[PDB]
Amino acid sequence: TQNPMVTGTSVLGVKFEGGVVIAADMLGSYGSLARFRNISRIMRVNNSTMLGASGDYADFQYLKQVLGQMVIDEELLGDGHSYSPRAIHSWLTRAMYSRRSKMNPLWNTMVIGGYADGESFLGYVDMLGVAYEAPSLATGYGAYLAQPLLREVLEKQPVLSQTEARDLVERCMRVLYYRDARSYNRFQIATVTEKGVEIEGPLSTETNWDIAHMIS
Amino acid sequence: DLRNVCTEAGMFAIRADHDFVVQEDFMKAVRKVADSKKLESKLDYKPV
């Protein structure tokens, strides 16, 4: 992909005690046009990992396909081995990098969340193959709007409960709805705990517009 | 090959113990009778 077409905007992630939460609005934008206002930008990849993607939705679908096939191929063996979130992140990094180095990149920015072996995992993969781990992640405008808040919290209270994390995510998605002109008040939250991957249906953000009466 | 089929089953019949044959000592034979029939390559030969 040299020219992205239908795109999704920011994706959020935050670690908490014994789990990870990821959020993403359900919009595919064609330029400025909110053309598909009901697509998911989150995938369940096995039981201990999940993926969220900003950027070109077609390339995201391709990665969704490939990844799915990889997981199926592996679960066919039944050797009591399964892809760890770090392994999926590694793979994804090498993939993006390889396409980047062929000058035909996958125009995605992706957030991988997972829980395995008692540890939370949250990884970011660029379309250039810039990859890293962090306690909080935000793609796109989320890196300029949401991540200041998320970092502010996580450097005053490093360990969050699932509830604190969900609240945090709702507030960040709210900020995004206020300031990102290609976002949507209808988003998904996915959570990975030891119970598995749960993907909560279309959620709305409550908004305040009292400053509309502070013109004069 | 059919007669044998009877005779074969008959050995199952006499076999173990059941003076009275059934539908069991039949098929067993039948395939059995059609099993070894693999050792008979070319059993047809027309004239001129």
Binding site: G28, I39, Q61 | -
Partner: protein
């Protein structure tokens, strides 16, 4: 170009304008943009005419062979997936916006969008083409869950009429086709049959 597809209970409803342009000139004022991919799967084309025709041919080929090899009427999702594979793999050399819509004994009436990038999503209703931009409003305010076949027919007819009115790259005649287990019902809405809207004067 303005293409449209609505799902109802027994099946689907397709519509398109008939104008194919090269610049501001109308090379074909009476184009058929609804293309049968199988006996009960149709595709609506938009974008490059060469590209869409080529891809439609290719998918027709593949899906034909597949349906013969399974001896079953193909799934709509299957046609859509094949279009999606070609439109994605060659996204840098194709400009095609496809709407695959049809009926299928396994999932009933369905509509899938394959816009230019090569993504695929199922939709209750879909629009595409240059003129589509101008009827997002109407189609958003008029749509309603549980329309009858005739209702959907009137719906697409009106929407296409509006788009044709506003978009210069759209016009001519409207082509409809309803698809259900019954079969394919095509009609052509021309001249006075096309819904009119009283235009503001003073």
């Amino acid at each position: 170009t303005t293409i449209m597809a609505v799902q109802f209970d027994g099946g689907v409803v397709l519509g398109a304008d008939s104008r194919t342009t090269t610049g501001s000139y109308i090379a074909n004022r009476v184009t058929d943009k609804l293309t049968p991919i199988h006996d009960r799967i149709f595709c609506c084309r938009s974008g490059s005419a060469a590209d869409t025709q080529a891809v439609a041919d290719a998918v027709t080929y593949q899906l034909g062979f597949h349906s013969i090899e399974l001896n079953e009427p193909p799934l709509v999702h299957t046609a859509a997936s094949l279009f999606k594979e070609m439109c994605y793999r060659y996204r840098e050399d194709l400009m095609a916006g496809i709407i695959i819509a049809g009926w299928d004994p396994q999932e009933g009436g369905q509509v899938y969008s394959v816009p230019m990038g090569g993504m695929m999503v199922r939709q209750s209703f879909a629009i595409g083409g240059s003129g589509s931009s101008y009827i997002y409003g109407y189609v958003d305010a008029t749509y309603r869950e549980g329309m009858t076949k005739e209702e959907c027919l009137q719906f697409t007819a009106n929407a296409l009429a509006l788009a044709m009115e506003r978009d210069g790259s759209s016009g001519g005649v409207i082509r409809l086709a309803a698809i259900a287990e019954s079969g394919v019902e095509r009609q052509v809405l021309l001249g006075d049959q096309i819904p009119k809207f009283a235009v503001a004067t003073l």
